[PDB]
Each structure stands twice: as C-alpha cells, then as structure tokens.
Amino acid sequence: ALKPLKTWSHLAGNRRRPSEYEVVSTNLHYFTDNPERPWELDSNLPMQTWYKKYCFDSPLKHDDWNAFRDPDQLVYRTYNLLQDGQESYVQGLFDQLNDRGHDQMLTREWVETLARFYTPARYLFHALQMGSVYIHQIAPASTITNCATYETADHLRWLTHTAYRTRELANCYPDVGFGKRERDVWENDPAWQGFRELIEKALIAWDWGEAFTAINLVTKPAVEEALLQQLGSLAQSEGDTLLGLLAQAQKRDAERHRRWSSALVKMALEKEGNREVLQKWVAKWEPLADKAIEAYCSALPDGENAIVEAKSASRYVRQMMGL
C-alpha cells in the first residue's frame, strides 16, 4: 500500500514546505502530457495542430517549464486582496476629485488633448487584454499561464478606468464627442497608427514564445512609457491631478507584469540558444515599437523629448533583463 504524503506527490522531496502558491498553481496543464496528441480526441483536429505548432514547436525551449515561479507568487485569493485595495484607492480618487469639481477646472486645450491622447486608449488597453489572454491559453506551463491570467485582468482594469473616466468627461464636456469619437481617432489619427500597427500585427503572432516577447517584452513597455509615463507627467503639469495619479496607479500593475516577464526570461537564459531566440524576436519587433512611440509622442508637447525618454526607458526594461 502507498503511504499518504505530506504534500502533492509532484512537490514531494521539495526540502521546504510548499506554499499555498505552489499548491494551487503548479503542474496543472495536462495537454503537455502528450505532445503527439495533446487533447483526448483525434490527433488531426485543427486545435491539435495549433498547439503542436505554436506551443510545443516554439524556438524558445526549456526541459521543465512547470518549474517557473511567479516572483510575486500571485493566487486568485491574493490578487483580489491586493487589487481590491488598489481599487479602493482609485475609486476613492474618482469619487472625491469629482466632489471638488476637478474636471471643471481643466483648460479647454487640455480637454482636447484628452479626447485625442487619453480616451481612445480604451482600444489599445482592450487590445493588450486580448494579447495577454492569448499568452494564457498557449503558454507551456500553468505557472506561466496564471501570470498571464492576472495580467489580463489588470488589462481589463485599465480599460475599465478609461471607460469610466470617458463618461465623466463626456458629462462635463458633452461637445467634445467623448465616448463617441475614440474609434475614429484610434483608426485614423496618425498619432495612433504607430501603436495600432504594432498591436494588430503582434496580435497574430501565434507562437507562445513570440507572443510573450511581442506583447510583454516589446509592446507593453512601449505603451506604458507612452500612455502612462509620458502622458501622465504631462497631465500633472497640465493641471490634471486625477489622470496624473490614475496613470501612476496603473503603472503599479505594469511593473508587476515586468517582474514576472523578467523572471521568465531569467529562466529562459539557462537554456543555451534562447537569448539569441529572444533577441531575434525583439529585433523584429523593436522597430515597430519605435514607430509607435514616435507617432504618439511626437504629437505631444515637448514630443521630441518625450520620444527620447520613452525609447530609452522601454529599452532599459529589456536591457536589465539581460537582453
């Protein structure tokens, strides 16, 4: 007879008592159990082929992805605690800054800057949502997938803040077209085509490894420095404390995504040849990221400086990741 264990059998002989995180997040995917036939059906189904090509056949290789650990060790239970805290904060700003008529004291020029540079971000934020939710359903291991899960929720969070604020701005300035014209700005404004080209193309990079890179290593730092960092500093200097603070709040999430992205790369570089794989995808996408920062920040005041600070900062992300 088998003796009952003091932990999950796959964690046994771990030397240290497994955390709640290890207990509820590890070795969960089962499709990786049979590379030749990942799902319990015909091996020729189009979805069998999809996972085989884009998951198992990725150039980014490792012998035990399930070994990956989220540096923050997030779990559903702790994600809601942390975020419900953060939301109390942002929702608090919303409620009280509204109370002292913060939106009524913004200047006309700045209101137009928001209609062009702020509100249409709801499209780019949802796009990142779609992008990070794809990494989730194609990643090779459950701990990697989970990071993508919570990051997708943060993405929906940013989208949400933006949706809310757009309604408030439309109520305060019904003549600007708030809520109504963001789609045309997103689709036709030259300041958005840099970013729109980037994500639309990155959204069809089906390889799990390239997806991680295209969205997390290249696109996100670009969007975060452009829309959160640069527009955030401008908002503050322009009298918009709400957006200056809101932007900063969302950057807390972004920093978290960079932490696990960076950890995954750390692990990836143990395997010989991966750095080159990662640098090749970065080199393929980085050019589009520059074109995104340029088009967006060039249209902002002190654009040339914003474009330089952003390019520099986003690259710094990958630099210290050892790339």
Partner 1 sequence: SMLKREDWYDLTRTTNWTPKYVTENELFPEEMSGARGISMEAWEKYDEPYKITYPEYVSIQREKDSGAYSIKAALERDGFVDRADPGWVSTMQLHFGAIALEEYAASTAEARMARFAKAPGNRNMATFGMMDENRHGQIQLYFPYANVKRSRKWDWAHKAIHTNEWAAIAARSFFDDMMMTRDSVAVSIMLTFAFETGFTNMQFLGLAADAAEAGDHTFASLISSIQTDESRHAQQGGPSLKILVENGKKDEAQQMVDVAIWRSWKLFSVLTGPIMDYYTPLESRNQSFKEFMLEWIVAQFERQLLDLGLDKPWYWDQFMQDLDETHHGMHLGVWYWRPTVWWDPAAGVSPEEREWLEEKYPGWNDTWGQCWDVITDNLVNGKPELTVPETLPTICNMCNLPIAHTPGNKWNVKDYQLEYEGRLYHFGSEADRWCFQIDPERYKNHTNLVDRFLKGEIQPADLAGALMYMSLEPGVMGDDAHDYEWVKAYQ
The binding site for its own copies (CB under 8 A) comprises 85-86, 88-90, 92-93, 96-97, 99-100, 241, 245, 248-249
The three-state DSSP-derived secondary structure of the chain is CCCCCCCCCCCCCCCCCCCHHHHHHCCCCCHHHCCCCCCCCCCCCHHHHHHHHHHHCCCCCCCCHHHCCCCCCCCHHHHHHHHHHHHHHHHHHHHHHHHCCCHHHCCHHHHHHHHHHCCCHHHHHHHHHHHHHHHHCCCCCHHHHHHHHHHHHHHHHHHHHHHHHHHHHHHHCCCCCCCCCHHHHHHHCHHHHHHHHHHHHHCCCCCHHHHHHHHHHHHHHHHHHHHHHHHHHHHHHCCCHHHHHHHHHHHHHHHHHHHHHHHHHHHHCCCCCHHHHHHHHHHHHHHHHHHHHHHHHHCCCCHHHHHHHHHHHHHHHHHCCCC
Residue 261: CB atoms within 10 Å: 23
Binding partner at 157 among its own copies, partner 1, none, C-beta below 5 to 8 Å by kind:
partner 1
302 alpha-carbon distance from chain centroid: 27
Contact status, residue 127 vs residue 199, Cβ threshold 8 Å: yes
Nearer to its own copies, 49 or 96 (CB): 96
Contact status, residue 201 vs residue 303, Cβ threshold 8 Å: no
Whole-number minimum distance, CB 59 to its own copies, in Å? 39
Side chain identity, residue 50: W
Nearer to its own copies, 56 or 89 (CB): 89
Binding partner at 166 among partner 1, its own copies, none, C-beta below 5 to 8 Å by kind:
partner 1
- Residue 266 found at the interface with partner 1 (CB under 8 A): no
Nearer to partner 1, 140 or 238 (CB): 140
Nearer to its own copies, 49 or 237 (CB): 237
Which of 48, 58, 216, 262: binder of partner 1 (CB under 8 A)? 48
What is the footprint of partner 1 within residues 94-113 (CB under 8 A)? 94-95, 98-99
Nearer to partner 1, 122 or 257 (CB): 122
Binding partner at 183 among partner 1, its own copies, none, C-beta below 5 to 8 Å by kind:
partner 1
Whole-number minimum distance, CB 166 to partner 1, in Å? 6
- Residue 28 found at the interface with partner 1 (CB under 8 A): yes
- Residue 137 found at the interface with partner 1 (CB under 8 A): yes
Binding partner at 248 among partner 1, its own copies, none, C-beta below 5 to 8 Å by kind:
its own copies
What is the footprint of partner 1 within residues 55-84 (CB under 8 A)? 75-77, 80-81, 83-84
Which of 93, 203, 269, 299: binder of partner 1 (CB under 8 A)? 203
- Residue 167 found at the interface with partner 1 (CB under 8 A): yes
Nearer to partner 1, 197 or 309 (CB): 197
Whole-number minimum distance, CB 85 to its own copies, in Å? 5
- Residue 47 found at the interface with partner 1 (CB under 8 A): yes
Binding partner at 23 among partner 1, its own copies, none, C-beta below 5 to 8 Å by kind:
partner 1
Whole-number Å distance between alpha carbons of 221 and 67: 26
Whole-number Å distance between alpha carbons of 317 and 254: 12
Whole-number minimum distance, CB 173 to partner 1, in Å? 15
Nearer to partner 1, 194 or 306 (CB): 194
